[PDB]
Design a protein around this ligand. Structure first.
Ligand SMILES: Nc1ncnc2c1ncn2[C@@H]1O[C@H](COP(=O)(O)OP(=O)(O)OP(=O)(O)O)[C@@H](O)[C@H]1O
Ligand SMILES: Nc1ncnc2c1ncn2[C@@H]1O[C@H](COP(=O)(O)OP(=O)(O)OP(=O)(O)O)[C@@H](O)[C@H]1O
Ligand SMILES: [Mg+2]
Ligand SMILES: [Mg+2]
Ligand SMILES: [Zn+2]
Lengths: 651, 643
DNA sequence: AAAAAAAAAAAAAAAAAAAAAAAAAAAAAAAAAAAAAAAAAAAAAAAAA
DNA sequence: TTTTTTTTTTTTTTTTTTTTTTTTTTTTTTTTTTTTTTTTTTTTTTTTT
């Protein structure tokens, strides 16, 4: 039976509502702009915030979240109409324009555990971690055939009956003419869309402790396919649906369910920030107005809750900004990443600096001394066990590519692990091979490590070599080494205890009202949106209980994030005055007679020390947004290296 | 949409009257000559450069690159129709398949009945009687694609990708047309094979067995059938074209015919071919729809950028390269061109060039002495050991780079792994096998597993790998020269301890190395300032500071080294006493001192193969005394840092 | 001219074969998946001056 | 920091069950339609005094 719907009142109302929501030109044209923008950069999926739809038309919003395919096909018809109105040529260039969904899903925000059968055919938001991706396969959507006998060319379309009943006539691939003349397929004239299945598991830190994990199968269709890789924490929005079984004759009543993605997104910490023109204006104002002391303003504003360690904070800012990688014509490579090691007495807030960089930096990976063991730290090679083939698995330092590995308790890490990270800490790559596969994975990361000295506490009366239990090969590739020392000076105690007690009295405005306790318990998280994939920004923090009062402000965390993102892209070029100063500075550093007696070397001075002078000067110039590495930048680099590389041995 | 008779006339016209001045400026018909050559069965592969097609019909090149399988068939049709009129003699029947083609053609003529219209099935399939095979060379106006980004939108299109070959099956016969004979009739039955599997036919369809309504069971046979050399490889994304947090993606390349036996695992290649699907029917498919696997049907496979090929057969070059090779400072110029961004280490670079060139292998009365030079850079932290090793890896034609323990165990040796074409257990080599006749750069040699150090013993001297474990019982074949990098015993040379107590290598392994170089960096104002100026210039301009001689491009270095490689020189008798005296003197001073490494007959053999390499760099056929002098001098400079 | 006849000749009903149409219609076997457990090689951390 | 036993732990498989999928498959009645009879109701050529 083949009928057509002459009049579907519901479809008419739905399409009219969706086109009305999209036209948007009277209401500050946000989706008008979004559609012109997807036309511009040659996409065909429009990501629609359901909060905007809920504002403009709440009845559509409920219908769409609750009847996902009917409403989504209506909304994609409306979107194709809108694109054709804006541009008919682009609209005809694509057969289908898809709508992805975004925003706040009230009870439709689930995990693979709470995604139950009361959600079939509803739009849901599921968060989890990718356990297995499949290969990206093409699925034929339109097959073209040529008969050499009769010179005829035919074409046969295949509808997406992934979650609908498929009758066997729907999937017959034509091989013969009606006269039983052999057909031959035109592969370049046929249309294939690519297809991928992933499995999303409940995140290990969100699942109930001690229970086995729950997963959901997810279907990804064209332009959504390579969006996730195993081990990614993603958010998938799609329709939850029951897959058809194979034509049987007996059914057990059981259906495989699946999520048909309409949008996939990563952790929003690692995404390109949105930059309003006012933000770029503010950044330019900041950089131009304060240029000499902008670096110190950013540095002392780094971890405000940590008092002191101003040189450590300058170095950590340099790590957050980085040098510039050299890519020579013959393929030779020089790293622009800064590696920092903190060795110190117990409880001097070095685990806190590691954690701050974890919170702030994009693509920061945590690890502890024995939580990662070789293969878990760099890559791994396993066998697929279902295809028999070698498979590469990214470890911590590959996942931290263009990011930071924050290794804590670095000293308690085994010796083989540190040997393993030697090659990453200098070449920014992991060379891995079993016999069937060999690879050279990119791990362009900066390492921020915290260690404790031998004997637990630093001994003021012993050489830093005898007190840091690491060898010159490992130390030398840590381009800044800071001995964070617990001196029990009473005025220093005044300062620190005041700051600490002042941080233990602050209540967050509004949220806290006098006696509140923060915790929520395993439901309150899914009650509201995740602040990990969620979508006016000042420059300085207003005065508060964090600081008493003075004539020097505190850069806002959000503004600092935007500023550092902008400045990290800069590639300041070393000038000749800087080059001469750095060269002579390094030559002076190497010669020990310049440095006093009773002063030992924390780490050796090698050509790596020269490279790090260059890297630190470049990062400083990035902070000023200079585009040139001037003499002030070189001086700041040299003074940081001078502070770090020498320690006074007492007696 | 378009008419393929007209397209066939277009491609015929291209093949017949395209000309170029390639033959020394003489105007040749580029493809008519090849039609002659493969009409006389002196050639199998016809590589149709699409740049040539684009000179006079870019719309045709667009059509080709958009369907690319219709047009491969069209080009094969057109050349098959053009061959009879390019045949100027009678083929000598060099093959056994040729006899079958000739007998089939002669029988068809014999029972011709030219005016009688025979059934469409009563004919020879085209593929059964071709003997040639036609391939495209992608237009250069097509920018190469990245393996990750070759997706469903490019199915059926001609694309060019480049990556490392990770895995190649063995060449094995793929059935193209299955031939059957009957037990009743005397006709042959042909079954062209397109799928990865086929059901063999049972009953014959010939005219006689239909007239007689006889049983007519047919029998599949290899003798009349058409096979093609088939080979499946896996190719992998290059490192500098992978997204940030990702691992490289593979693609299956199906290589058949004359493109087989080009790529070996470890090769950097550029593959031109059609991205094509394999129906993937059969599974308990979760999803309804015609899902399929993908592969690149290889048309042109080109090794490149470290494993460049054609230059080897193109040793003839400009008069320039004649004049530089003739020059006396050629050895110094080649040594200086090794990693020009690294400052200093002039003698280290000379030794590295010797390792690249290598000595001559001897095979006297069944007792093999290998000409490989093995070098260990035993150095302080941050003296550019890893940079030199990484450079040598990027330079040498068959080079694998290995750091501490990512490539340990079977990552150096072989392993047995399942295949797919036959489903049995194939043996896959690791770094020492992937570098079988090249260099294996072992970084962090001192932090290497003891099992791997033992394997390196047996590789370095016997140039094999003996495995007698459970799944594997083989002697692999590992003719590589080992370039090792290590730190002294405690990460830095300690002058208060003895030389071997710093090296921390046993005498046996220390003797495995023809040149073991100590690299200490004592500070000093002048040299540190010069090193800093070099390094800061490299940072400033992404190049080394200019010097008197421009360093050779890595292509020229490869060509010069390769041209040196086939220059086996002989040690003359007139040098026997000089070499023996040098060895004896070296041997005596080894135990006269109290700070000397183990010395043995291997020290003589090191002198001898180093001097052979030096003679080879001068393109001479006998070793002179200056080569032995340079070998001696490099052997002292290896430990000069101790002073 | 009408009066018996004595046929057509139309209808209803029957037969009466054809020749086409219509109507009935689960259980047995297999394979794949996912899970286990087991021989082997391989990679860790306790031993001592 | 050279040697050395538990420990896994990734890889080979094998089992192995449970579940979903796969594979197999004419005969027999009924009915309409056509072409025949057959009793009965006319009706159209026969003749007389
Ligand atoms: N200078 C400081 N400013 C603010 N807080 C501090 C400071 N020093 C220590 N603290 C407090 O001490 C507590 C412990 O700090 P943390 O855990 O970072 O110590 P640590 O240096 O990592 O110790 P260990 O080396 O033993 O791991 C933190 O809560 C931190 O707030
Ligand atoms: N002589 C030199 N010329 C140029 N660059 C140098 C030189 N020595 C060191 N460098 C620079 O120092 C950096 C460190 O070099 P590299 O990693 O090769 O040291 P290494 O010898 O491997 O040390 P280790 O023994 O610790 O592995 C490189 O980026 C290199 O460019
Ligand atoms: Mg801590
Ligand atoms: Mg190194
Ligand atoms: Zn027959």
């Amino acid at each position: 039976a083949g009928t057509v719907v002459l009049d579907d009142v519901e479809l008419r109302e739905a399409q009219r509502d969706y086109l009305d929501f999209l036209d948007d030109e009277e209401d500050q044209g946000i989706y008008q702009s979004k559609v012109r923008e997807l036309i511009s950069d040659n996409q065909y999926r429009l990501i629609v915030n359901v909060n905007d739809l809920r504002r403009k038309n709440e009845k559509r919003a409920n219908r769409l979240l609750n009847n996902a395919f009917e409403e989504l096909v209506a909304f994609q018809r409306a979107l194709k109409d809108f694109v054709a109105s804006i541009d008919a040529t682009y609209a005809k260039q694509y057969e289908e324009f898809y709508v992805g969904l975004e925003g706040s899903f009230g009870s439709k925000h689930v995990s693979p555990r709470t995604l139950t059968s009361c959600f079939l055919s509803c739009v849901v938001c599921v968060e989890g971690i990718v356990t297995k991706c499949s290969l990206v396969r093409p699925k034929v959507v339109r097959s073209v055939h040529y008969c050499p006998a009769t010179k005829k060319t035919i074409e046969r379309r295949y509808s997406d009956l992934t979650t609908l009943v498929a009758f066997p006539s729907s999937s017959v691939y034509p091989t013969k003419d009606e006269e039983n003349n052999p057909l031959e397929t035109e592969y370049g004239l046929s249309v294939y869309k690519d297809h991928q299945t992933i499995t999303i598991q409940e995140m290990p830190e969100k699942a109930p402790a001690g229970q086995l994990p729950r997963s959901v199968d997810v279907i990804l269709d064209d332009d959504l396919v390579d969006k996730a890789k195993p081990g990614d924490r993603v958010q998938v929005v799609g329709t939850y649906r029951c897959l058809p079984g194979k034509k049987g004759g007996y059914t057990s009543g059981t259906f495989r369910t699946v999520l048909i993605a309409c949008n996939v997104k990563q952790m929003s910490k690692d995404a390109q920030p949105s930059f309003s023109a006012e933000d770029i204006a503010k950044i330019k104002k900041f950089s131009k107005t304060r240029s000499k002391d902008i670096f110190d303003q950013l540095a002392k504003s780094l971890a405000p809750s940590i008092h002191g360690h101003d040189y450590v904070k300058k170095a950590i800012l340099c790590l957050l900004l980085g040098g510039v990688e050299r890519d020579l014509e013959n393929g030779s490579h020089i790293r622009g990443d800064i590696n920092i090691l903190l060795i110190g007495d117990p409880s001097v807030a070095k685990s806190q600096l590691l954690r701050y960089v974890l919170c702030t930096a994009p693509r920061a990976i945590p690890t502890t001394g024995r939580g990662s063991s070789g293969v878990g730290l760099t890559a791994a090679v396993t066998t697929d066990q279902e295809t028999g083939e070698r498979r590469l698995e990214a470890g911590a330092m590959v996942l931290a590519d263009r990011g930071v590995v924050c290794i804590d308790e670095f000293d308690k890490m085994s010796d083989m692990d540190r040997t393993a990270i030697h090659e990453v800490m200098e070449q920014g790559r992991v060379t891995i091979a079993k016999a069937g596969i060999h690879a050279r994975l990119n791990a362009r990361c900066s390492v921020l490590a915290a260690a404790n000295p031998v004997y637990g506490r630093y001994d003021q009366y012993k050489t830093p070599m005898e007190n840091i239990g690491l060898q010159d090969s490992l130390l030398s590739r840590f381009d800044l080494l800071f001995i964070m020392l617990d001196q029990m000076d009473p005025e220093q105690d005044r300062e620190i205890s005041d700051h600490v007690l002042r941080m233990h009295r602050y209540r967050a405005p509004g949220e806290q009202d006098g006696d509140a306790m923060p915790l929520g318990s395993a439901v309150d998280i899914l009650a509201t949106d995740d602040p990990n994939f969620s979508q006016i920004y000042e420059k300085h923090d207003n005065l508060l209980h964090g600081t008493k009062k003075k004539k020097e402000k505190m850069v806002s965390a959000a503004f600092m994030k935007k500023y550092i993102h902008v400045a990290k892209i800069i590639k300041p070029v070393l000038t000749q005055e800087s080059a001469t100063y750095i060269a002579e500075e390094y030559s002076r550093l190497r010669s020990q007679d310049s440095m006093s007696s009773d002063t030992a070397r924390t780490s050796p001075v090698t050509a790596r020390t020269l490279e790090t002078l260059i890297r630190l000067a470049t990062a400083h110039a990035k902070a000023r947004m200079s585009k040139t590495v001037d003499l002030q930048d070189a001086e700041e680099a040299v003074e940081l290296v001078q502070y770090a590389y020498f320690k006074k041995v007492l007696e | 949409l378009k008419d393929y008779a007209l397209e066939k006339e277009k491609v015929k016209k291209f093949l017949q009257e395209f000309y170029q001045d390639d033959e020394l400026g003489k105007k040749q018909f580029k493809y008519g000559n090849q039609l002659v050559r493969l009409a006389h069965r002196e050639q199998v592969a016809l590589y149709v450069d699409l740049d040539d097609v684009a000179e006079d019909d870019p719309e045709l090149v667009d059509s080709i690159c958009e369907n690319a399988r219709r047009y491969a068939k069209l080009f094969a049709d057109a050349v098959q129709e053009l061959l009879p009129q390019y045949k100027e003699r009678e083929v000598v029947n060099k093959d056994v398949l040729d006899v079958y083609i000739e007998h089939r053609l002669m029988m068809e003529q014999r029972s011709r009945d030219p005016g009688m219209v025979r059934s469409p099935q009563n004919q020879y399939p085209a593929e059964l009687m071709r003997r040639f095979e036609l391939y495209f060379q992608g237009p250069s106006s097509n920018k190469p694609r990245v393996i990750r980004e070759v997706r469903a939108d490019s199915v059926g299109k001609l694309v060019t990708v480049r990556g490392i070959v990770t895995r190649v099956s063995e060449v094995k016969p793929k059935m193209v047309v299955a031939t059957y004979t009957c037990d009743q009739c005397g006709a042959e039955t042909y079954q062209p094979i397109q799928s990865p599997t086929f059901m063999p036919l049972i009953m014959c369809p010939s005219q006689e067995c239909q007239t007689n309504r006889s049983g007519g069971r047919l029998y599949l046979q290899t003798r009349g059938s058409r096979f093609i050399k088939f080979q499946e490889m896996k190719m992998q994304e290059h490192s500098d074209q992978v997204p940030v947090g990702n691992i490289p993606r593979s693609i299956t390349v199906l290589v058949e015919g004359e493109n087989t036996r080009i790529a070996q695992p470890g090769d950097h290649v550029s593959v031109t071919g059609i991205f094509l699907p394999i129906l993937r029917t059969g599974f308990r498919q979760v999803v309804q729809g015609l899902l399929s696997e993908t592969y690149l049907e290889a048309h042109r496979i080109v090794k490149m950028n470290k494993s460049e090929d054609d230059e080897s057969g193109a040793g003839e070059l400009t008069r320039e390269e004649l004049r530089q090779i003739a020059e006396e400072d050629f050895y110094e110029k080649l040594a200086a061109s090794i990693a020009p961004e690294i400052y200093g280490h002039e003698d280290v670079k000379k030794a590295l060039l010797l390792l690249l060139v290598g000595g001559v292998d001897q095979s006297p009365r069944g007792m093999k002495i290998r000409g490989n030079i093995n070098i260990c850079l035993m150095g302080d932290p941050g003296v550019a050991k890893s940079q030199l090793l990484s450079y040598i890896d990027r330079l040498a034609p068959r080079s694998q780079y290995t750091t501490g323990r990512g490539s340990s165990g079977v990552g150096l040796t072989a392993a047995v792994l399942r295949d797919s074409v036959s489903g049995e257990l194939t043996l896959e080599g690791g770094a020492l096998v992937l570098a079988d006749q090249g260099v294996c750069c072992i970084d962090e040699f001192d932090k290497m597993a003891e099992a791997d150090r033992t394997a390196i013993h047996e590789v370095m001297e016997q140039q094999t790998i003996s495995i007698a474990k459970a799944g594997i019982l083989t002697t692999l074949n590992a003719r590589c020269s080992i370039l090792a990098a290590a730190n002294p015993a405690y990460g830095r040379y300690n002058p208060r301890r003895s030389l071997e107590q710093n090296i921390q290598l046993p005498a046996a392994l220390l003797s495995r190395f023809d040149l073991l170089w100590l690299i200490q960096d004592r500070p000093d104002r002048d040299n540190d300032l010069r090193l800093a100026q070099h390094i800061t210039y490299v940072h400033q301009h992404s190049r080394q500071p200019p010097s008197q001689f421009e360093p050779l491009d890595m292509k020229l270095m490869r060509r010069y080294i390769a041209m040196c490689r086939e220059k086996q020189p002989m040690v003359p008798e007139s040098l026997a006493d000089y070499i023996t005296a040098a060895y004896v003197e070296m041997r005596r001073e080894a135990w006269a001192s109290k700070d000397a490494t183990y010395t043995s007959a291997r020290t003589l053999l090191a002198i001898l193969r180093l001097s052979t390499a030096l003679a080879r760099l001068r393109m001479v056929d006998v070793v002179e005394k200056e080569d032995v002098n340079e070998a001696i001098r490099l052997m002292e400079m290896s430990k000069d840092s101790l002073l």
